RNA sequence: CACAUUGCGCCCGCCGGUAUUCCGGCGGGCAUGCCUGUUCGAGCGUCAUUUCAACCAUCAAGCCCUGGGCUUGUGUUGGGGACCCGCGGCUGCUCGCGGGCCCUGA
């Protein structure tokens, strides 16, 4: 790769994205909840990593983190689920008292798997919940249950899928739940918030959104630098033998190549 | 029960006479209509009865630079939209695998 190339990729599209948004409507009625700031802030970048052999043999429900030195879900308006095995009476009290008060906020609900399987089964009541929140975060113990709990509402778009968090401390739930200290779930918590993933599909493309185009495009070049290194080393099988094009994509725009 | 005669039935117990069987006597009870409840029933009066449940890993196994992190545990209803793509065939049009956006009651 090169940097001066990438970044030059990088202003390149926010330059067409930004006169794609400020374009106006041809049909002459505008729009009511929507902002030329605020369109261009909410349209996510994706990057387009294309092999020649498959990632997986086959789909990979769980996906994968790759920490970023500037994480993505930074927004106020971003409201996050967090789904647990234990009584989820014992995490709201968590969540509550002994929290600290900015990410409280990006807390939407939590909710164990059993209010979960109650709850929501019908198809509605899973699609409510998927436009309702954002992002999905949910413990190891259940992350192999949330598939039939939610059905191809979430494990088809593949865009809010669960996110794996630990909650290992090293059965009754009303007796005692086992939990990590407090302070440093918050902290893997925040760390899970802010982490791009990839979604270890069959296929020879696998597409990572790794910011916005309201960043910088020098911040958007780093995030976009350290998820190519981080993604070969670790995902792709055969590393960079195995590697092809690498196309900056915007969702409503063309490709941008890179070969690596 | 009987014009009521100090006569005669049925049930439980007792007493005195040779007494488990006989005799006599004594004590407690046995009318009708109706109400509340109890228990035992009757009816070709009506109904239900061949069970749409729960039941993956609410944690295990292996590791690393000894305490945090990592890997494996394959688990998804269907359909539609002159929308934006990646990769394979197709001389080509186009068709397949996988994505991003949107809609819909299992």
Known sequence: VDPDQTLKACKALLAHIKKAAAAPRPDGKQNLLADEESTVAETPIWLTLTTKKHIHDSHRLQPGKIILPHPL????????????????????????????????????????ISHLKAKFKAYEAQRKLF???????????????????????????????????????????????????????????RKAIGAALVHLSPSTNTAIKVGYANWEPEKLAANIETVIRELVERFVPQKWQNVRNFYVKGPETAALPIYQ
């Open 73 to 112: 879900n930074t927004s106020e308006e971003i409201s996050v689920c967090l789904i647990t095995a234990d009584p989820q009476r014992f995490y709201k009290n968590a969540v509550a008292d002994e929290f600290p008060e900015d990410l409280r906020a990006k807390i939407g609900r939590v909710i164990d």
């Open 131 to 189: 436009s309702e929140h954002d992002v999905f975060l949910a413990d190891t113990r259940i992350i192999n249950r949330l598939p039939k709990a939610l059905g191809k509402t979430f494990y088809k778009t593949t865009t809010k899928r669960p996110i794996p968090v630990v909650l290992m401390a090293q059965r009754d739930p009303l007796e005692n739940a086992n939990a990590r200290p407090i302070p440093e779930i918050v902290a893997e918590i």
